[PDB]
């Protein structure tokens, strides 16, 4: 079958590698980014997936070479300030904890953590960086009234 | 089955109706919005769809009550300045022409028009407004070197 089913797709893969293009691009309000996913899940649903699993694939495709690059991608995406102590990850055994400051969807209040897409992204990116399969579970979230979101990172086989 | 398969989906439907929330939301650079679609089409592909057909559904869901509201949604989305003469649409027979100024993806150069998602959106929105089934075909595009994109609007049964 065809590598790319739509016209714009090869160009998007070039652009995500170009910080000047990202900085000059039009910015879309997050409610519309979410609406897209909502509309295409209605269409997925004769198949099925999750925002976490899509974030995993998204993360793979972003393919950051290191933690500093991971942090940079989150600023470029306007997804917030990712707090990761890399030297401690290297020194310690898992599970680890990482935090996100100034995340999207702060206008949302929910009892349960909301950032499933971001958690997937983090799992996917951490595999690209460190090789291991990771599972990332958000255990605290700004939308619960917390000041930062907190993610538990687990290495798995 | 469940109305909403993900946590954030009911909240997104409320937010798209709230201009204050849109204005205060985080803005995402368009290359990442496109990457999302690229990643979830790879996953769609054991099924199949198009950016045009998703735009149709997106348009339906936005459900603008009139042309002025359609124009406003495009500014809120940061998708550009939509040029539509409503009094002429009312007076004349189809097909019509509408234009878009300052669209996304101006860093893209392509021989063929690129704004398939926007063209779908327009078809879907025009059906919500006028009831008829519409087909919208982009016949000129900024990414061809033109100053504005141009869409042909056809009424169909
Ligand atoms: Cl937001
Ligand atoms: Cl853009
Ligand atoms: Zn969170
Ligand atoms: Zn165009």
Curated annotation (Swiss-Prot), chains A, B:
This is Uncharacterized protein MJ1460. Belongs to the M.jannaschii MJ0150/MJ0739/MJ0745/MJ1460/MJ1642 family. InterPro entries: NO_sig/Golgi_transp_ligand-bd, V4R. It comes from Methanocaldococcus jannaschii (strain ATCC 43067 / DSM 2661 / JAL-1 / JCM 10045 / NBRC 100440) (Methanococcus jannaschii). Pfam families: V4R (PF02830). It comes from the Archaea.
């Amino acid at each position: 079958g065809m590598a790319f089913m739509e016209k714009i797709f090869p160009d998007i893969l070039e652009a995500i590698r170009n910080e000047e293009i990202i900085k000059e691009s039009k910015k879309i309000p997050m409610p519309y980014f979410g609406l897209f996913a909502l509309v295409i899940f209605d269409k997925v649903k004769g198949s099925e997936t999750s925002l976490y699993e899509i974030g995993e694939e998204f993360g793979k495709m972003l393919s950051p070479k290191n933690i500093e690059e991971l942090k940079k991608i989150f600023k470029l995406m306007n997804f917030g300030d990712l707090e990761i102590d890399e030297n401690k990850i290297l020194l310690k055994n898992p599970p680890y904890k990482i935090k996100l400051s100034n995340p999207p969807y702060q206008w949302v209040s929910k009892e349960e953590p909301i950032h499933d897409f971001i958690a997937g992204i983090l799992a996917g990116c951490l595999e690209e960086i460190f090789y291991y399969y990771f599972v990332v579970n958000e255990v605290e979230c700004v939308s619960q009234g917390k000041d930062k979101c907190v993610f538990e990172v687990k290495e798995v086989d």
